[PDB]
Amino acid sequence: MSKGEELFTGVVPILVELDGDVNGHKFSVSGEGEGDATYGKLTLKFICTTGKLPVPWPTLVTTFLQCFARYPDHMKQHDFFKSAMPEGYVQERTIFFKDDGNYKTRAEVKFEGDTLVNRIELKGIDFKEDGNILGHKLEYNYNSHNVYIMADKQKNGIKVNFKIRHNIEDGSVQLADHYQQNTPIGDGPVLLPDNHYLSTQSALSKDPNEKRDHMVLLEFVTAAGI
Ligand SMILES: [Ca+2]
Numbered sequence: 001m002s003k004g005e006e007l008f009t010g011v012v013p014i015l016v017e018l019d020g021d022v023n024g025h026k027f028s029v030s031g032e033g034e035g036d037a038t039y040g041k042l043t044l045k046f047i048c049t050t051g052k053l054p055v056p057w058p059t060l061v062t063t064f065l066q067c068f069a070r071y072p073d074h075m076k077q078h079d080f081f082k083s084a085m086p087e088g089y090v091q092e093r094t095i096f097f098k099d100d101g102n103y104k105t106r107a108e109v110k111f112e113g114d115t116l117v118n119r120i121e122l123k124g125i126d127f128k129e130d131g132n133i134l135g136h137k138l139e140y141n142y143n144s145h146n147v148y149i150m151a152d153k154q155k156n157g158i159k160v161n162f163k164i165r166h167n168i169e170d171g172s173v174q175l176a177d178h179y180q181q182n183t184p185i186g187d188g189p190v191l192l193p194d195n196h197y198l199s200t201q202s203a204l205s206k207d208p209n210e211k212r213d214h215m216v217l218l219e220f221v222t223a224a225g226i
Contacts, residue, residue, distance in 0.1 A: 001083075013032075022101075043217070045216050059097075066147075092180070137169055199221070
């Protein structure tokens with residue numbers, strides 16, 4: 001029931017730019033890809049433009065585009081993310097790594113021309129030099145998670161909560177608690193949803209012809225009502 005639904009009927013080019021500071025280690029990541037919300041499909045490649053990434057790539061996956069979720073027709077009235085477009089929304093997160101530090105992210109997600117842009121500032125603090133994050137003990141993979149969206153009618157936005165389980169290379173799990181807030185950038189109306197969730201599956205790979213520190217990401221995202 002929004003104008004934003006119509007900007008995503010096709011393949012949309014995607015740009016991501018991130019400035020990061022984790023425990024004084026500063027770093028930048030650029031990403032390009034393609035989005036096809038008809039099939040909740042994202043294809044992305046990310047490159048650390050400042051050298052080697054001081055954290056594990058799986059820890060950045062959630063930070064690096066839920067407006068490409070596929071909402072089923074009987075649920076399109078609950079798609080906040082597209083309803084904010086093209087002016088966009090601000091996405092903020094606190095990500096609490098269990099027994100370790102935490103990321104704090106602020107992201108502006110909007111269209112620039114025909115290109116969907118994710119611009120992200122990230123600051124991580126209180127990480128243990130030899131935890132699973134700074135000591136790079138996380139496996140290069142990703143499990144499937146459900147994200148629970150809730151309307152936040154007082155801020156004209158949504159609240160989302162979920163837990164990621166990073167596999168550690170000894171077989172254990174490193175827990176990342178995500179606390180997320182989205183807010184429209186514009187004045188216009190947005191779709192405030194009933195409670196629902198996004199089902200996400202991600203696949204991480206390498207580009208065989210790339211020598212810079214990088215991550216290829218494939219992600220499918222479908223909404224699911226209750
Ligand atoms: Ca309702």
